[PDB]
Amino acid sequence: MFRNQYDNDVTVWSPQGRIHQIEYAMEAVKQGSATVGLKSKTHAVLVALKRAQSELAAHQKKILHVDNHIGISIAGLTADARLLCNFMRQECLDSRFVFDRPLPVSRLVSLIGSKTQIPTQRYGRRPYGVGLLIAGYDDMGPHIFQTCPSANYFDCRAMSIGARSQSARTYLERHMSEFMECNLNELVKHGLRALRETLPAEQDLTTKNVSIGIVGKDLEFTIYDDDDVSPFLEGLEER
Amino acid sequence: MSRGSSAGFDRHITIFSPEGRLYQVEYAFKAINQGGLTSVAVRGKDCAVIVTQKKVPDKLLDSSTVTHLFKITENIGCVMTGMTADSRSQVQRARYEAANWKYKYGYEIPVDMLCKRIADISQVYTQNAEMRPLGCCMILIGIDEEQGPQVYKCDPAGYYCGFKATAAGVKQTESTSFLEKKVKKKFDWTFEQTVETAITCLSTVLSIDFKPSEIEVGVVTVENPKFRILTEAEIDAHLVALAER
Amino acid sequence: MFLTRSEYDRGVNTFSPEGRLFQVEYAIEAIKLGSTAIGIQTSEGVCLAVEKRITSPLMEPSSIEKIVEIDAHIGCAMSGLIADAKTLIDKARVETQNHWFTYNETMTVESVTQAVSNLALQFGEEDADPGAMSRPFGVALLFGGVDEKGPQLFHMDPSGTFVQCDARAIGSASEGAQSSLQEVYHKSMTLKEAIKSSLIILKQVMEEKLNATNIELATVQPGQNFHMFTKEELEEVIKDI
Amino acid sequence: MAATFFGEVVKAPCRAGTEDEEEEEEGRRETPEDREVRLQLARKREVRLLRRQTKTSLEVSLLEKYPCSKFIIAIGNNAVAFLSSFVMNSGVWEEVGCAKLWNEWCEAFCVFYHLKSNPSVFLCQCSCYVAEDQQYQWLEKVFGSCPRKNMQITILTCRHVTDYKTSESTGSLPSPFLRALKTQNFKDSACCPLLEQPNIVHDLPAAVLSYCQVWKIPAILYLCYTDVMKLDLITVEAFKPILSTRSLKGLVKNIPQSTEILKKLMTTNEIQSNIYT
Amino acid sequence: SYDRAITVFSPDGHLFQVEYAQEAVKKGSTAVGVRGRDIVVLGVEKKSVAKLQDERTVRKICALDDNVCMAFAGLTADARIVINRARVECQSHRLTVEDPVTVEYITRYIASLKQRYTQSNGRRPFGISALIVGFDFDGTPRLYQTDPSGTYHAWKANAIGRGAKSVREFLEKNYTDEAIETDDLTIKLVIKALLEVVQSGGKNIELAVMRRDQSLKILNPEEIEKYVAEIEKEKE
Amino acid sequence: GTGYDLSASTFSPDGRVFQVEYAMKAVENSSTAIGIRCKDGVVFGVEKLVLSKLYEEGSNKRLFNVDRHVGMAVAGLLADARSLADIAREEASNFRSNFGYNIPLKHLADRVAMYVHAYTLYSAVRPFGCSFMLGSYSVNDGAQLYMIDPSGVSYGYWGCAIGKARQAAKTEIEKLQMKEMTCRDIVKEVAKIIYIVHDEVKDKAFELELSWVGELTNGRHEIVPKDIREEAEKYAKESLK
Amino acid sequence: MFVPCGESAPDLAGFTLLMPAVSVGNVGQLAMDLIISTLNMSKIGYFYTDCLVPMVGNNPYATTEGNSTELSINAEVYSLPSRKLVALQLRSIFIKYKSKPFCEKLLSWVKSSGCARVIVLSSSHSYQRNDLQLRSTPFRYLLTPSMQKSVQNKIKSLNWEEMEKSRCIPEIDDSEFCIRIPGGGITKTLYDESCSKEIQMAVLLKFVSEGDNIPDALGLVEYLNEWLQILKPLSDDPTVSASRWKIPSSWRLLFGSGLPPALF
Amino acid sequence: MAERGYSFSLTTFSPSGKLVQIEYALAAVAGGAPSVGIKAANGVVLATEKKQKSILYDERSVHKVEPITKHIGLVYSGMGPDYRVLVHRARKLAQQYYLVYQEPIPTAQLVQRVASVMQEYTQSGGVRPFGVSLLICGWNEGRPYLFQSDPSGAYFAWKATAMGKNYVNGKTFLEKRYNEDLELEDAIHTAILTLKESFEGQMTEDNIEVGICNEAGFRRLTPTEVKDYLAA
């Protein structure tokens, strides 16, 4: 009630010391659909749930390709995800041009942090309403990063973001002690079981609603979609 | 915050009230008292002295970093009263403007010209809707060439004026009355008498017997034109010499 | 306690306490004031049918066309604000010609849709690249074309965001027409039956009756170019009932 | 309003609605150009109960022409879906009118059904969004001015979890959860915790609960505070505890087929727009 | 959720400021444009003429080039701005491609200017609608209309301004192929449409015709009164 | 100060800019960081809160390296703290590029504090809701510890605490005779103080984040090595009971 | 209209009606919460009308678990027959074109029920304060001509400042003067209709802005307590102030909800 | 006093056509220290009241009566900083005129250019009018000039005027005592008397300021000269 003067702009501090448009942008992230990221000692996989209005539409393109070693999964506003993906792709190109080597994932994520922090201080802007799960591979191994509308980024052992992603995070917290020595097949299965935990008890993972993206020691970032996910889904025990 | 002007007669800087008053400038003048410190500057026959309170309400705080006396040029020093960050930013601006003056005109800036430049900038702040006044007061001292000691006081409205003695802060009115009474009697205070006058004004309107660590004193002299900040031993010597009398 | 007024929708760039931007959903409501456009993607081609809604008999129908041509293999169906629609249409046209100049080949349907989306998602943020738009475009488009990957249909809404589809209805009766396309559509149907279903649904959701003057049909087939049905072709297709 | 140009004088929002001046400087010389506009706008936004095959002029309140002993209102997508899947899957329900209303946010209006086996039972099915200046008209067109106190109204609705006022974060709460709010004559205890003290409910559900409180009718309001306010399966399943309550006691016959009806009705799935993911 | 900002949608999806600019159009004097076979005619009512006025200075029919013409309804100062921009654009197009503007080209340019002003709520739309008649370079007569939003259409006959609805009903009922056969019948049809909203006709009527390969010709009050007299004779 | 508190360019009727005060309360929103200056260095320690067991250890660090010789411990909004870390790094690198030697810590504190102040001045940007401490060591300068707050006021400290429990931690620091202690005993005492002011029920499951710059690192900012941090945590735990 | 809670009117024979106005800052409503909570007044009825946006929630004055479950609607009437005081509490906002109908219905109830006085607790926009009003006290009062039952002299002895009469329509140098409470909501309508109907109404108000308006509510109840003595007179205690108006339990989470994680 | 926000915007006319934010800037002038200008037959007089009225002011520091060139001089009543910013601008404009035309700027030309600057500040929005009304005295072509430029940027040529506090009574006083054939000395006497009308106590040479403009050019009277004039 005493909140109405201080939550309409990202340039107003509430007398409790809170910016409220930042928190509302975080809600905008929660309005997507669940996507999961997890990594082993050699691979970093991204698993996403697609919505297509349940019929007559090709599903959302939820996993995007940024470079040969970086790929992102989005939850939140699509326009913001595309703006940030264009930024990431341009930065990776610039690194390859100037320095001839793949841009480190942590450096890319730091650049995203600055870029998305500027709208949360300036007038006439709004925070980015998209949260990302960045999967990378560089000299330092696999990486999973989570970026937020607040311009925070986190180094994750595993992470789920999106709508009803708390269930996936509960699964990942329960099972993260065995992710590292998993091979690619059962790592993708772990991600698939977490993503399934974000679903009603009746619905089940199919090829039509699952998108997978692997990067790893030998692999470049590849996205598996709509029929390429069948090898990964065939072996997934029932719930 | 984003943009626009707040509606109200006392809520934006570019709004007059029915009586033609800019109330945000007066609220900046009240911001000068935010800090609870008083400054006294006294002009003598051949010296100018700035004296300010030094409150350090923290055992953990390094007391050599708490200071309100600043060096603008080699020969101009100021005591800043008001909001601390605003004071330090206006000192930074005065330093830049003085360096530019020396660059353009080939000789070092006078005191009146420095306070005039700072007050011109302050006026620009009061007229535009994007900026706000600084909640601080600048009292500048220097020895000119052929006028003598100079004490000048810029203020948040863009007003500046030279004085024979001036005060800023909480006890500005009490100190101004004290110094008026002192200056009516005699004014050619040598150098010691100006320091005693400034310290006595501060210690009377505050009714506080000072310690060398509760007070800051910066001086210029005709024979030593460079701005100098007295050490605690020198202030203690002045205080014991004032107490014995 | 008390019920109080909270408003989060009177400006772009403001999230509601729900993570939701209302000035973009009001632009989608702006779409729902347009005329109904149905696009069906089949393996024999893609058809685009729109409801024309001629306001006066004195008005040249050729000037209110809701189906335009971006290139010989792509056509758009429009619904919403016309002035915005034509800006996006011209962006698509110029982009296809830029692509031909630079790379000596036809731009694919998805690439045209992506270029138009790059233009359409650049609202808000007005004091950054003046000449930008400052609000969502109030138009939804239906790019239906034929390229290296066969017939394709895309949909863009007042978000600058596109998704590939197989049967879309946009416009004022998109809910009823979409519910109808839900059953009448099957993934392997001929183009003649796609046109048939489009016109049947358009008859269902129009307040007037099907004559060859108040609707507009276009098709893009793998061999043939983009084609806008004429008065006599439309007459024959509707007299097929 | 929010600063169209540099230095434009802007007035702050007023949460009490007094920036409208309550139509101050009333101008007793309102031009007929103005009065025609005002009356036309008032006519555009009118509520109107109309009977099937009659199509207009129901002329009397809906609960005072038919007798009633039980009245279940579901408001919103999820409450309507739940009520349909788990209650109309049983014996025949007969429609006895809709409430046509025009709005900026309105979306099937309440169709009112009364059970053929038990004519005293009723259901309102609003996906209809009733605006503030339509809720009291809706109340008078449905209940009327003769509030017989033999009814047992049961309102069902959904709210976003971010509307919950809690000292924790509204992202740590286990959504969806049910909260109740019952009137004074509702003797039985609720199957869910009662809604807290700083929390209020303000809409047509609040209109019906306020009516039942004033006129001493038993009424229970069931609030699902969900994190997904579109048609969602978990949100609809959140209402299931209500089925073991005397109001919805004899109306729930086959739960196993209701899950299949619910899965089908989810596959219908009014199309989402591309703002997200 | 309201008006008062140019770039704000209402929850129904309406941009009301543009619609209020079109309200500004609907108060202006009625302008009637009829497209004939080899003549294109424009007629505006002279609403509330003052006797002590130089009527040459308050004319609402203007020439944009030697083949394109234009009448407007709405705020006259906005119309002056838009007209002069259109004139510069006609000459600039001739400089670019050597060919005379097609009537659609200049209609499109005028609409793009109005549409530029319907963006950016720090600007104000043009409160005018225009009736751009003309002949293409291959001789086809055209009649277009733009409105404050940046939206233009091609017409056979049209009316804008106050009483555009009555005049447009009259035109629909009376615009045939037998009303267009001669130049005189087109002129008389425009005058008859304008006589449906004009009281004390003839002296409140501003006709200007443009025949193919000829410049705009404003009809003086004598010719207009002769046409009105012919109309009353044909009334019998 | 309602009515005068929506902009950082509005003065309250008593000369108070309230957006800046709300930004300082924003600093009070976060968990505590303490910094103690000793006879031969500076030691930082942050009551870092474990958001999830899913985060790779070391993420969300609040102890930055601003230069080879300077370390930064932050509180408040972490995005703001990272932006200010970037600014401080830029200032130190620019000074070294221009003038060829390591930037003095007092000068670095002035540059960054004057940036923070510049944000407390306009309606176009909001004040930083983050406070931080800088700490260095040079043989020709001694240990130095500075704290900047959202208003742009930087002072030099012997012991500082910023965050939620700054007052309790400040009470606990005052008992230390830090002017005559080495970095090792200060590390143990910093761990103790972090453990004392931690609120074990409201907040949950924190992890120490210790860092020093001193002569034991030869004027180089570092993370306290794992074994010394283990010893400090064990001392801190055993002292708590 | 007024609907009792027990099929019987409570006989407000000569009571003083305390009512809010939905005004800027909700200061009148918050002051009414303070009064109803401190005096421990008991609900006696409802004011059911078409005029306020409907809302509902459990007892906003919960003190024990027994009465914390008592449903409340947007307009409810409370009473304290020991002190001959009746209080209305409007907890919602008015529907467009419905403020005046509410005012005539309420004042008809006041005349019929037999209430002696009416006291409206309100507020006004403080950004519209002119040169003088900035340097005066925030609190103003209005008395209708009938309200003279020895209370004009009491108010005079209290050294209060009357609401300043602006000119009815500006731009006219004659400047016919009539009251104008900008941001008082129904305050002016209530005043004008009371003057027409010959009701003893008083209006007490504060110039407030919006934000945390709890200090303003406490100030307004202290103004009213300078007049009425609904409480022991102010600085007479060993500074047991701050403990003399009972803050209702519903005055919780007034800035919303808790702080999200991973920020800060 | 907020007429529907017609009171707080500089770029909004009120329904009656008034701009009630430029007349609030004229209330800053009418709340400034009194000023007097008297155009005698052979010179102009500019007398003002000093705000720096206490003993603690250096009086070689800041002045209210300023020269623009050798032949033009200003006084103001209103807000002092605005005066200073306009004075430096007026001096620049005069020197640009000299640099172009090799002749001293005429009084009317200077008044016009200064008034155009003030007008600019009364039309944009996001900016604030000037809180000063100037009196410009000059001597051109063997003919004195007295002008007044107000915050709106509208200047007036006067024979005698009064600004600042109590200026309506001052103008009434001046009407009864001004005659065209007045000599510069009697003009100085009358200007000092008009200041003495609306003055807060005893008037010393150290709390008023006088500047004259005759054939020899504009000059600010020294405190001794003002003392001598006050003694008579």
DSSP symbols for B112-141: HHHHHHHHHHHHHHHHBSS----SEEEEEE
What residue has token string 């003038």? F99
Which chain F residue's Cα is nearest to A11? F126
F residues 87-146 near G, CB within 8 Å? none
Closest Cα in chain B to G125: B8
In chain H, which residues have their Cβ closer than 8 Å to the Cβ of B160? 62
Round to whole Å and give the CA distance between D26 and D30.
8
Q: Report the alpha-carbon distance of residue H87 to residue H76 in Å, rounded.
A: 10
Spatial distance between the Cα atoms of H188 and H195, rounded to a whole number of angstroms: 11
- Other Cβ atoms less than 10 A from the Cβ of G162: the count is 11
| CATH number reported for the structural domain that contains residue F192 in this entry | 3.60.20.10
Give the CATH class of E1-236.
alpha beta
Within an 8 Å CB–CB cutoff, is residue G200 touching chain C? no
Reported in sequence order, the residue ranges of chain G that DSSP labels E, i.e. its strands, are 2-4, 16-20, 42-47, 56-57, 72-73, 75-80, 85-90, 117-125, 139-143, 166-167, 177-178, 200-208
- E234 vs F142: CA distance, rounded Å: 111
Q: Which amino acid is at A228?
A: D
* Maximum pairwise Cα distance, chain B: 61
Select the residue of D4, D104, D105 nearest E5 (Cβ to Cβ).
Answer: D4
Separation of alpha carbons A177 and A158, rounded Å: 11
Domain positions in chain A are 4-237
- Cα torsion D77, D79, D83, D84 to 10°: value is 0
Find the helix packing angle between A78-99 and A105-117, rounded to 10°. 130
Establish if E115 touches chain C: CB-CB under 8 angstroms. yes
Cross-chain CB nearest to C1 (options G53, G93, G250): G250
Rounded Cα–Cα distance for residues H147 and H107 (Å): 8
Q: How far apart are the first and last CA of chain E?
A: 57
Distance separating alpha carbons of residues D56 and B77, to the nearest angstrom = 88
Contact assignment for A159 to F54 by CB distance below 8 Å: yes
Resolution for this PDB entry, in angstroms: 2.9
Q: Which chains touch A (3 or more CB pairs under 8 A)?
A: B, C, D, F, G
- The alpha carbon of residue A157 is apart from the nearest alpha carbon of chain G, in Å, by 17
DSSP D18: G
Whether the Cβ atoms of residue A215 and residue A135 lie closer than 8 Å to each other? yes
Those residues with Cβ within 8 angstroms of residue F87's Cβ, 6 or more apart along the chain or in another chain: F112, F115
Mutation target vs B (from F11, F34, F189, F190; most B CBs, 10 A cutoff): F11
* CB C5, CB D13: distance < 8 Å: yes
d(CA C164, CA C91): 19
User: In what side-by-side order are the strands of the sheet with C46-51?
Assistant: C167-170, C37-41, C46-51, C215-220, C226-228
Touch between E and C (at least 3 CB pairs under 8 Å): yes
Starting from the edge strand earliest in sequence, which strands make up the sheet with E216-218, in order? E157-160, E31-35, E39-45, E205-211, E216-218
* Contacting residues of A for F205, CB less than 8 Å apart: none
Q: How far A159 CA lies from chain C's nearest CA (Å)?
A: 21
The single residue listed with the structure tokens 């448009």 is: A21
Write out the two tokens for C63: 């000037």
Q: Show the tokens assigned to E203.
A: 């002296």
State the CATH number of the domain containing residue B127. Answer: 3.60.20.10
- Nearest chain D CA: its distance from H16 CA (Å): 17
Task: Tell me the residue ranges of DSSP E strands in F178-227.
Answer: 206-214, 222-223
For residue F189, the distance in angstroms to the closest alpha carbon of chain A comes to 30
What is the arrangement of strands in the sheet containing H160-163, beginning at the earlier edge strand?
H160-163, H35-39, H44-49, H208-214, H217-220
Cβ atoms F144, F37 nearer than 8 A: yes
Q: Which residues of C touch G (CB under 8 A)?
A: 1-5
Tally of domains within chain B:
1
Our answer on whether A and B touch (3+ beta-carbon pairs < 8 Å) is yes
What are C155's two structure tokens?
A: 């949909």
Structure tokens at H150: 């107000």
Residues of C in contact with D2 (CB under 8 A): 10-11
> DSSP label at B234?
H
Cβ of D220: how many Cβ atoms within 10 Å?
Answer: 23
Name the residue in chain G with its Cα closest to that of F51.
G262
Q: Mark yes or no for CB contact A31/D276 under 8 Å.
A: yes
- The amino acid at residue F163 is G
> And the tokens for C75?
């056509």
Residue F85 in contact with residue F66, Cβ under 8 Å?
Answer: yes
Q: How far is the C-alpha of D221 from the C-alpha of C141, rounded, in Å?
A: 43
Is residue D184 helix, strand or coil? coil
* Cα(D139)–Cα(D133) distance, integer angstroms: 11
**Partner residue opposite H31 with nearest CB, options B20, B166, B179:** B20
The answer to whether A152 faces chain F, any CB pair under 8 Å, is yes
Chain F residue with the nearest C-alpha to that of B23: F13
Q: Which domain holds residue F86?
A: 1-239
By C-alpha distance, which of G5, G4, G80 is closest to G38? G80
Q: Which among D199, G41, G100, D19 has a CA at the least distance from the CA of C3?
A: D199
Within a 10 A sphere around the Cβ of B64, how many other Cβ atoms? 8
Q: Does H5 touch chain D (CB under 8 A)?
A: yes
Number of structural domains found in chain F: 1
Q: Closest-CA residue in chain H for G171? A: H16
CB contact under 8 A, D11 and B130: no
| Cα G149 from Cα E187, distance rounded (Å) | 82
Q: Measure C17 CA to nearest chain G CA, in Å.
A: 10
Chains with 3+ CB–CB pairs under 8 A to G are: A, B, C, D, F, H
DSSP assignments along F166-182, one per residue: HHHHHHHHTT--GGG--
The size of chain D, in residues, is 277
Quick count: other Cβ atoms within 10 Å of Cβ H169? 14
Residues of B in contact with D10 (CB under 8 A): 4-7
Burial level of A208, CB count in 10 A (0-12/13-18/19+)?
Answer: middle
Look up the CATH number of domain C9-241: 3.60.20.10
Q: How far is H71 from chain B (nearest CA, A)?
A: 24
Could you say which of A8, A59, A78 has the minimum Cβ distance to residue C14?
A8
G8 and G191 Cβ atoms separated by less than 8 Å: no
Of D275, D174, D204, D270, give the one whose Cα is nearest residue D231: D270
Q: What angle do CA D48, D50, D54 make, to 5 degrees?
A: 150
What is the distance between the alpha carbons of residues A107 and A110, in angstroms, rounded to a whole number?
A: 5
Q: Does H8 touch chain D (CB under 8 A)?
A: yes
Residues just before a chain gap in chain D (C–N exceeding 2.5 Å) are: 106
Other CB atoms within 10 A of residue G61 CB:
22
Q: Which CATH number fits domain A4-237: 3.40.350.10, 3.60.20.10, 3.30.1490.20, 3.20.20.70?
A: 3.60.20.10
| H-only helix segments in C104-190 | 109-120, 174-184
Contact, F168 vs F21, CB < 8 A? no
Q: Is B94 on the interface with F (CB under 8 A)?
A: no
Contact C159 D14 (CB under 8 A): no
The C-alpha angle E27, E32, E33, rounded to 5 degrees, equals 140
Choose the mutation target among A18, A54, A59, A77 for the interface with C, i.e. most C CBs under 10 Å. A77
G155: burial class by Cβ within 10 Å (0-12, 13-18, 19+)?
middle
Interface partners of chain E (CB pairs < 8 Å, 3 or more) are: C, D
For residue D87, give the DSSP letter. Answer: I
- Give the DSSP letter string of E35-103: E-SSEEEEEEE-TT--TTS-GGGG--EEESSSSBEEEEEE-HHHHHHHHHHHHHHHHHHHHHHSSPPPH
**Contact (CB<8Å) H127/D7:** yes
Which of F104, F107, F186, F88 is CA-nearest to residue F142?
F104
Q: Is the dihedral of CA F99, F100, F101, F103 positive or negative?
A: positive
Are chains B and H touching, using the cut-off of 8 Å on CB pairs and a minimum of 3 such pairs? yes
Question: Across the interface, do D12 and A163 touch by the CB < 8 Å criterion?
Answer: no
Closest of A165, A219, A174, A204 to residue A45, by C-alpha: A219
Q: Specify the fold of H4-232.
A: Glutamine Phosphoribosylpyrophosphate, subunit 1, domain 1 (3.60.20)
Those of residues 86-125 in A touching chain F at CB distance below 8 A are: 110, 113-114, 117, 120-123
- Distance between CA atoms of A120 and F79, rounded to whole angstroms? 9
- Rounded to whole angstroms, how far apart are CA atoms C190 and C194? 6
Cβ distance of C163 and D2 shorter than 8 Å: no
For G46, which residue in chain D has the nearest alpha carbon? D214
Quote the tokens at residue F135: 């700490």
β-bridge partners, G89: G76
β-strands D70-75, D153-160 pairing = parallel
The amino acid occupying position C107 is M
Q: Do the chains contact at A30 and D267, CB–CB below 8 Å?
A: no
Structure-token match 């330090």, residue found: B88
